C-alpha cells in the first residue's frame, strides 16, 4: 500500500513546518461577504478568461455544421434536385 494518498495522520504530504493557517469560526463571519461582488465581477472574469478556448472550437464546429446543413437543405429543395442526382 504505497498509496499516494494516506489517511489524516499521514496523507503523504511532505514536511510543511513553516506555514500557518488562519480561519474565523463561521459563527462569527459573514456568509455573503463577496456574493454580490463575486457573482458579477468574478464570474465575468472567469468567463472572459475561459471564453476563447470555448468560442474558437465552437465557431469552427458550428460553421462546418451550418455549411453542411445549408448544403443539404439546398439539395432537397427543387433548385438543387439536379445536383442531388449528380452527387448521388
Amino acid at each position: 500500500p504505497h498509496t499516494y494518498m494516506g489517511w489524516w495522520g499521514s496523507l503523504g504530504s511532505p514536511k510543511q513546518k513553516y506555514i500557518t493557517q488562519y480561519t474565523i469560526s463561521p459563527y462569527a463571519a459573514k456568509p455573503l461577504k463577496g456574493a454580490a461582488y463575486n457573482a458579477v465581477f468574478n464570474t465575468f472574469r472567469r468567463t472572459k478568461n475561459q471564453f476563447l478556448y470555448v468560442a474558437i472550437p465552437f465557431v469552427v464546429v458550428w460553421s462546418i455544421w451550418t455549411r453542411a446543413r445549408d448544403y443539404n437543405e439546398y439539395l432537397y429543395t427543387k433548385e438543387g434536385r439536379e445536383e442531388l442526382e449528380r452527387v448521388n
Binding site: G9, Q16, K17, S25, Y27
Partner: protein, 417 residues
C-alpha cells in the same frame, strides 16, 4: 492581615502579612501589560520592567513580573530585611525615568528577545500564547506578554519613557507585600521613599472574543500540541470560581504518571482505551474582564488528534447534561486545594494581591473563596455550562503534527448535539 493602606498620594499598599511565612516579598505593580501596548511598541512593558528589575539590589532578589494586564517588579527577602526591600523598590521606582534614560537597552533587548524566542520554542507556551491571541485578534490583548523579536528590536528609551510616564502613576500603581512583618513599618518606609508623578488611571483597552483557529502545522516535532477553549469568565465575574470548578471537573492527565489509570475524570478513562493523548490540562485563564476556558493537550500520536478532540469536546457537552454530583464535589475540592496551593509562596501571593487590587479593586481571602465554591451546586455548573460552553464558539490553536487535527467546523460542531 490583609489590611490596606493608602499613602498621602493615591498609592494603595496591600499586604498579606501572615506569621509562619517562610520568606517575605514586596513588589510595586503598575497595571500596564501587553494589554496597554500596541504592535509598534509591543513588549515595551516587559522591557521597561526588566530594566528596573535589573538594578542592583542590596541583597534582595529583584524579579520582573510580566503579564497581559499588569506588570511590576518584585523583591523577595528574609522577613527581617523586608523594610530594606520596600525602601529599595521605592528608590527604583522614584528613579525609574532617570535609570531608563541612561540605561543601554541593547543587552536588555537581547535578553527580552531571547525570552520571547524561548517562549516560541516551548510548544505549550507557543500554543497558549497563540491561543490567547487568536481569540482576541484585532485588539491589544492579542499581543504577546513578552513581545516579539521584530517588535522588540525597534524599542528605544523614548518608547519606554513614554510608557512609564503614561502608566507608572499613583492611580495606576499598587504596592503588594507578604510575609512575617509589621504592616505599619513597611507602609511608613515606603511613604518616606516613594516619589512618583500623579496621573489618571489609563483606561483599560477593550478586547472581545472571536472564535478562530490558528494552525502552525510543524511536522518535525515529535508530538501534536493543541489547545481548545471558549470565552470563559474572567476576573470580577460572579462565575470566576465557577469557571475554575468546571475546569477541574476534567482536570489534568499525564499518560506516563502512576495516577493515570486511577484518576477520577471521565475523559482520563476514555483516552486510555487507545492511549489517545499523552497529556492534557484544563484551565480557566482569567484577565481583567475577559477569560478563556479550555484545555491544553499534547498528543504523541499522529493518528489520534481527531479522536482526542472528539472525545474531549464530547465530554464538555456533559457540563450541561448528566453532570454528576460526585464530579462537582470533586471539582469543588480540587479547585479549593489548587487555589490554596497557588497562595503558599509569599512571592505568589504578592503577585496575586497586586493582580486583584489592580484589575478588580478588591480581593477575597481563601475564607471567602471557600465560602463561594462550597455553595456551588450541580445546577449552577449546568447553567454555566449552557451559558459558556454549550454551542459556544471555540478558539483552536495547534503547532505540532497538526495534520490530523480536523478543521474548525468539525471541532466546533462537537460542541453541541
Amino acid at each position: 492581615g490583609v489590611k490596606y493602606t493608602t499613602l498621602s498620594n493615591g498609592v494603595t499598599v496591600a499586604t498579606e502579612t501572615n506569621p509562619a511565612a517562610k520568606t517575605s516579598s514586596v513588589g510595586l505593580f503598575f497595571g500596564a501589560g501587553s494589554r496597554s501596548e500596541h504592535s509598534h511598541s509591543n513588549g515595551i512593558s516587559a522591557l521597561t520592567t526588566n530594566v528596573l528589575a535589573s538594578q542592583s539590589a542590596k541583597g534582595s532578589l529583584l524579579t520582573a513580573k510580566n503579564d497581559r494586564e499588569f506588570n511590576g517588579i518584585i523583591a523577595q527577602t528574609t522577613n527581617d530585611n523586608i523594610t530594606e526591600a520596600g525602601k529599595l523598590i521605592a528608590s527604583i521606582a522614584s528613579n525609574a525615568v532617570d535609570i531608563v534614560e541612561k540605561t543601554d537597552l541593547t543587552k536588555h533587548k537581547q535578553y527580552l528577545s531571547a525570552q520571547a524566542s524561548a517562549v516560541e520554542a516551548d510548544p505549550k507556551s507557543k500554543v497558549l500564547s497563540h491561543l490567547y491571541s487568536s481569540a482576541f485578534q484585532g485588539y491589544s490583548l492579542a499581543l504577546p506578554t513578552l513581545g516579539t523579536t521584530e517588535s522588540v528590536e525597534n524599542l528605544e528609551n523614548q518608547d519606554s519613557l513614554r510608557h512609564l510616564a503614561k502608566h507608572l502613576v499613583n492611580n495606576n500603581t499598587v504596592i503588594a507585600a507578604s510575609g512575617n512583618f509589621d504592616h505599619d513599618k513597611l507602609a511608613d518606609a515606603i511613604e518616606a521613599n516613594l516619589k512618583i508623578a500623579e496621573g489618571v488611571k489609563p483606561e483599560i483597552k477593550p478586547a472581545s472574543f472571536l472564535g478562530s483557529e490558528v494552525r502552525m502545522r510543524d511536522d518535525t516535532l515529535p508530538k501534536a500540541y493543541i489547545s481548545i477553549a471558549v470565552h470563559g469568565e474572567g476576573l470580577n465575574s460572579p462565575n470566576y470560581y465557577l469557571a475554575k470548578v468546571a475546569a477541574a471537573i476534567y482536570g489534568d492527565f499525564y499518560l506516563h504518571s502512576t495516577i493515570a489509570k486511577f484518576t477520577s475524570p471521565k475523559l482520563a478513562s476514555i483516552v486510555q482505551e487507545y492511549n489517545i493523548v499523552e497529556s492534557y490540562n484544563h484551565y480557566s485563564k482569567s484577565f481583567s474582564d475577559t477569560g478563556i476556558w479550555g484545555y491544553y493537550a499534547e498528543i504523541a500520536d499522529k493518528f489520534t488528534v481527531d479522536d482526542f478532540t472528539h472525545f474531549s469536546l464530547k465530554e464538555w457537552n456533559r457540563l450541561s447534561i448528566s453532570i454528576s454530583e460526585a464530579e462537582v464535589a470533586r471539582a469543588k475540592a480540587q479547585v479549593k486545594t489548587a487555589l490554596a496551593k497557588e497562595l503558599a509562596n509569599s512571592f505568589a501571593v504578592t503577585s496575586d494581591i497586586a493582580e486583584k487590587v489592580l484589575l478588580v479593586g478588591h480581593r477575597q481571602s481563601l475564607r471567602e473563596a471557600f465560602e463561594k465554591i462550597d455553595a456551588i451546586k450541580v445546577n449552577d455548573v449546568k447553567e454555566w455550562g449552557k451559558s459558556k460552553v454549550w454551542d459556544r464558539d471555540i478558539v483552536i490553536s495547534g503547532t505540532g503534527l497538526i495534520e490530523d487535527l480536523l478543521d474548525y467546523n468539525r471541532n466546533r460542531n462537537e460542541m453541541a448535539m
